[PDB]
Amino acid sequence: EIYNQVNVVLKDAEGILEDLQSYRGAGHEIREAIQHPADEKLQEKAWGAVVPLVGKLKKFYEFSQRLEAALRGLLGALTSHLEREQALAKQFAEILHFTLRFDELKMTNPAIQNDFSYYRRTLSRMRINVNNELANRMSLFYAEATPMLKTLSDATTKFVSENKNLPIENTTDCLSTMASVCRVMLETPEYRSRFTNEETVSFCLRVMVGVIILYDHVHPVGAFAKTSKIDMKGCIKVLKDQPPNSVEGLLNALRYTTKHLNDETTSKQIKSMLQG
Amino acid sequence: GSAGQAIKCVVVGDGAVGKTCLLISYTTNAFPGEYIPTVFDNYSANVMVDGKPVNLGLWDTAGLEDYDRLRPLSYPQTDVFLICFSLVSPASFENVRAKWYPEVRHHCPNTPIILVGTKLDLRDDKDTIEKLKEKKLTPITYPQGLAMAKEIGAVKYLECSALTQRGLKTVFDEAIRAVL
Ligand SMILES: Nc1nc2c(ncn2[C@@H]2O[C@H](COP(=O)(O)OP(=O)(O)NP(=O)(O)O)[C@@H](O)[C@H]2O)c(=O)[nH]1
Ligand SMILES: [Mg+2]
């Protein structure tokens, strides 16, 4: 499946950020090695220190290429009725969440480019008496202030540029609608006081079920129908992820305050909602 | 020391003018006596200029004539250019008006230029000045450097030494000040 293609690479995302934060570098060993070129004993300590760091930098770069390939593979499936387009929006939010941290840590860490530059500077020296083509791409990767954002933006623009028949809106709509719903969740009006972190998450669950029930009543086909925009099966699963004590009020509300739940057309898998 | 303004700064100039050394001397406060050519390299440093934080992205380029087709791929989205020539090498000093100004303008015509004079410590050295005599040559003096900067339309002419670090800090500070 190419729908959990981005989720498969994100498995190691926590490990990448954890390794990137712990990346102290080897600026001290590199510096003293340059200060005393002739000291071969000190050149070994510097070179020996660099190997570990480069291997992690290659591990970080290769991750961005897999994440790039996974994102384009995800956008590729867009092309090919009953389009599950939440995958696009869900995985966009997930990789962007990771992307902001990766860029933030790299941004404020000049040791990364320092180490790398030394590494390829001492390869040449060693040329006198990793893959070379890969190293050049890696050099250009870490040269940027925001490598991941640059990689994502380039990858998405590469997709739309070689899919000109599809308008920019198709792919950029999810990105603009997500920012408006977030504002709805996070924005606090004048009439009431600001919600807590517990209330905003609670609120978010209520509106989700709230708009579904109101949509079910006003929209002809409803929220339960096979040819619906709601995709409830997924919305109920999110509710049953939550503690049983929490969301019982919302869970019940769907059971008896809907319109097209009990009608014949509704799936019997959706009806699987009991309580004791 | 958190995140700052991302300012890209590409350094161009011939081989052995001191492009790589003045970047390594600035960021790491170390001077490599060993000479190894660099096709392309990059460094960075979080610095404070005029009370504003800056993540100064430094792009080191090749000086050799064999990397003319490969050098200009690092040019796009440049905020400032450092055309570096050695003060102890007239050839390099003319290559400024002959090649670099044409080249950097050709790709990025609206991006500022900072004309930098490298190896300032060698201009007043018997050993180094006798060899210029030997090769029938007179070191590029300040008036010449400034006159050249005025011709190419560089916003500032600076002269510094990567070894002594005399006016090394001022070059990058002025490089940032041009993009604020
Ligand atoms: N005395 C002195 N030597 C310097 C100075 N700056 C650089 N050098 C010397 O210049 C040589 C290397 O210059 P470098 O910075 O590598 O030149 P480059 O601009 O990188 N040339 P390339 O395009 O080939 O990479 C070394 O011998 C180094 O010690 C300086 O200010 N003073
Ligand atoms: Mg160099």
Side-chain angles (χ1 to χ4, degrees), chain A residues 3-197 199-274 276, chain B residues 1-18 20-96 98-134 136-180:
Chain A
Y3 267 45
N4 67 332
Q5 194 177 14
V6 196
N7 296 331
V8 158
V9 315
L10 276 185
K11 281 174 177 177
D12 310 49
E14 191 174 30
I16 292 286
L17 292 183
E18 203 162 28
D19 284 334
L20 179 58
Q21 193 171 17
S22 57
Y23 190 89
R24 268 178 148 278
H28 293 238
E29 287 85 339
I30 288 169
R31 196 188 159 282
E32 76 171 337
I34 287 180
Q35 286 295 71
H36 333 305
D39 191 352
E40 66 177 22
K41 170 265 184 178
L42 228 61
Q43 293 293 336
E44 283 185 348
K45 287 282 282 180
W47 177 246
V50 174
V51 176
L53 278 36
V54 298
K56 307 193 82 185
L57 296 195
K58 192 183 80 170
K59 177 185 167 74
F60 298 154
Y61 175 73
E62 283 181 330
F63 185 84
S64 69
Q65 295 305 133
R66 288 172 56 191
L67 191 67
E68 169 182 338
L71 175 52
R72 286 197 287 93
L74 172 65
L75 280 168
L78 219 48
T79 328
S80 324
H81 217 357
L82 167 124
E83 49 168 356
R84 318 143 167 154
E85 174 176 10
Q86 210 102 211
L88 192 64
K90 221 294 142 170
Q91 279 157 341
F92 257 131
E94 283 293 341
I95 70 178
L96 281 168
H97 165 80
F98 157 82
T99 294
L100 286 177
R101 206 51 212 323
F102 184 95
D103 290 334
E104 185 168 28
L105 292 184
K106 187 275 167 193
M107 205 147 189
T108 63
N109 195 343
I112 291 168
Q113 336 203 199
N114 205 75
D115 294 354
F116 198 59
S117 316
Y118 177 82
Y119 170 85
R120 23 200 282 123
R121 239 224 3 141
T122 75
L123 273 177
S124 309
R125 193 168 79 99
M126 274 166 40
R127 268 210 320 83
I128 265 94
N129 287 337
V130 303
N131 181 28
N132 186 25
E133 185 274 326
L134 180 60
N136 287 47
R137 277 183 294 154
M138 286 177 67
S139 186
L140 285 156
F141 178 75
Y142 292 115
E144 296 296 328
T146 60
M148 277 293 183
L149 181 64
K150 181 59 62 176
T151 301
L152 258 68
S153 57
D154 285 2
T156 51
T157 52
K158 180 163 67 268
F159 169 78
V160 70
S161 60
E162 75 189 33
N163 286 113
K164 295 196 182 73
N165 64 311
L166 299 179
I168 191 67
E169 267 68 26
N170 276 22
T171 58
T172 58
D173 273 11
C174 68
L175 291 189
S176 61
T177 46
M178 267 197 290
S180 37
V181 186
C182 288
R183 202 186 154 187
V184 165
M185 294 305 179
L186 296 166
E187 183 186 325
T188 67
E190 294 183 0
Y191 79 82
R192 65 165 171 80
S193 55
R194 174 152 59 83
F195 282 145
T196 64
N197 287 19
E199 284 178 323
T200 37
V201 171
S202 181
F203 171 75
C204 180
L205 283 158
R206 315 233 320 159
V207 56
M208 189 184 77
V209 172
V211 299
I212 281 178
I213 294 165
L214 194 268
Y215 179 93
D216 188 58
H217 270 261
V218 305
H219 194 89
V221 296
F224 299 88
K226 300 193 304 187
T227 65
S228 186
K229 290 167 164 282
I230 300 305
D231 183 5
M232 180 101 73
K233 188 197 78 192
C235 293
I236 293 170
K237 194 272 196 178
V238 166
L239 258 54
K240 295 209 78 178
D241 269 16
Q242 312 276 320
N245 254 28
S246 69
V247 309
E248 188 64 13
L250 300 182
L251 197 57
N252 270 344
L254 283 167
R255 289 204 260 262
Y256 330 112
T257 234
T258 46
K259 183 156 155 181
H260 310 283
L261 168 54
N262 306 63
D263 68 342
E264 184 64 17
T265 57
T266 304
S267 179
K268 188 45 103 161
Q269 228 67 150
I270 275 327
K271 302 218 202 183
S272 298
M273 289 180 326
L274 206 84
Chain B
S2 47
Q5 197 167 330
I7 293 178
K8 181 166 171 174
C9 176
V10 169
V11 162
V12 320
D14 299 44
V17 302
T20 298
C21 285
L22 77 71
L23 290 171
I24 295 172
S25 180
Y26 178 67
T27 56
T28 328
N29 295 340
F31 181 85
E34 189 72 10
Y35 173 48
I36 307 158
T38 30
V39 199
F40 73 53
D41 263 345
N42 57 26
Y43 315 93
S44 58
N46 295 252
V47 300
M48 278 285 294
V49 188
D50 297 352
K52 304 179 75 184
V54 168
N55 178 227
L56 182 62
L58 298 166
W59 295 58
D60 189 23
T61 61
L64 292 189
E65 195 172 10
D66 286 330
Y67 302 117
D68 298 16
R69 276 70 173 179
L70 170 65
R71 171 166 46 257
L73 73 74
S74 53
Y75 279 35
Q77 272 70 31
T78 26
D79 296 315
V80 69
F81 276 101
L82 299 193
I83 300 173
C84 301
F85 72 66
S86 161
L87 296 160
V88 184
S89 163
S92 90
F93 182 63
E94 289 291 350
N95 285 340
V96 174
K99 182 167 183 180
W100 302 124
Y101 171 57
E103 182 163 17
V104 301
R105 278 285 103 105
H106 169 33
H107 288 54
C108 301
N110 292 30
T111 61
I113 312 296
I114 298 283
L115 185 53
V116 180
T118 49
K119 302 164 166 225
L120 173 55
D121 66 323
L122 295 186
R123 183 148 71 180
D124 297 325
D125 180 16
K126 232 198 176 95
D127 280 283
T128 321
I129 200 159
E130 243 135 357
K131 304 258 164 176
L132 287 198
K133 282 196 235 271
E134 173 166 339
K136 269 215 175 345
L137 271 192
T138 136
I140 304 304
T141 190
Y142 192 111
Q144 294 185 243
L146 174 50
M148 174 68 76
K150 185 177 180 179
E151 272 192 345
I152 65 174
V155 302
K156 298 288 171 170
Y157 168 82
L158 278 315
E159 22 66 290
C160 69
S161 177
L163 176 46
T164 65
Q165 304 196 23
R166 256 76 165 179
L168 177 57
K169 178 163 296 303
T170 311
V171 167
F172 292 97
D173 288 358
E174 279 296 344
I176 293 164
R177 276 199 181 90
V179 200
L180 289 181

